[PDB]
């Protein structure tokens, strides 16, 4: 099986910042997971990578010249993107994998979320 992903269809960044919540159909409390944000239709660029611990600790990484921050919450991960450029207006996709406790699962392709940076 696969995890489900609900993300807002549209978000306007105000003052070059936005909060992208990725809603999963899985209990990420006390789980070893790896959440991802990808930008672009071809999902090439990986914007942010939020690794989750069993003891609900987070290791957030911002890879491609993005200012990313991460917050965990039950069946969701929130990506707080700051200092976005206007030229970064695009479709963003939430990705997830759970490893422990088993089984290993990944997400079914989400519809994405259009971020308009103003």
């Amino acid at each position: 099986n696969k995890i489900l992903v609900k993300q807002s269809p549209m978000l306007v960044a105000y003052d070059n910042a936005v909060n992208l919540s990725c809603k999963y159909s899985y209990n990420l409390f006390s789980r070893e997971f790896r959440a991802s944000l990808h930008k672009g239709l071809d999902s090439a660029v990986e914007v942010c990578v939020v690794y989750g611990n069993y003891s609900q600790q987070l290791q957030v990484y911002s890879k491609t010249g993005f200012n990313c921050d991460g917050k965990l919450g039950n069946e969701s991960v929130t990506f707080y993107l700051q200092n976005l450029y206007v030229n970064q207006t695009d479709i963003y996709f939430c990705k997830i994998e759970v490893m422990y406790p088993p089984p290993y699962l990944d997400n079914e392709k989400s519809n994405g979320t259009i971020i308009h940076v103003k």
Partner: antibody
Amino acid sequence: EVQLLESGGGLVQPGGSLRLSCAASGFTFSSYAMSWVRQAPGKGLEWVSAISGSGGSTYYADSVKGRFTISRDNSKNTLYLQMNSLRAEDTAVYYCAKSYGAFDYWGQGTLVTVSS
Amino acid sequence: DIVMTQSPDSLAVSLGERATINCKSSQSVLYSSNNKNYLAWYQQKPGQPPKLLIYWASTRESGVPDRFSGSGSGTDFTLTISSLQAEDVAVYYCQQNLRPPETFGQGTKVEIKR
């Protein structure tokens, strides 16, 4: 028929490096987490490391941290283990295992002997 | 650092009679979210790679006979072979898969008493 076939083991000097491989068939390799489990001759099983179906998440045992690296090529259906800075203690039969709720399938094993 | 301790180290039981192996976890491997205990049992015959028998403490793997049965929750667990067969002489291992690093018990050697 699911098959896991290990290779790359044998005799190596202490301090030296060895790379193990585990080829898979008979299932969608990229859909499952893989592990390496080792068993020293006449001893119990010791979990070594695990890698997600995608390769994005890797975990390691306390004893092998900083020395061993678990990787995979889903296009080749092969799982790798890069053992560096080997010690005598690392001598064991190295199994590769497919996970789903537990280790539901195990390979035959490849014998790594670390000795001068 | 979740430690698994089995008992006994060795066990000899007559053909057809009941065998019991205990496995004690140093921390509760009961996941409160789905009430499942993340504990597995393997059988390892000599010179052969291990074989999964039980997972989620009591759920029996495809093709494992009715006689193997896992039981317990939290920290103490039990594997039961109702009617020991000749083909069951192996070393049994318990294993937690709740959190990394995954850890195994020391193993229990089961023998036929004759």
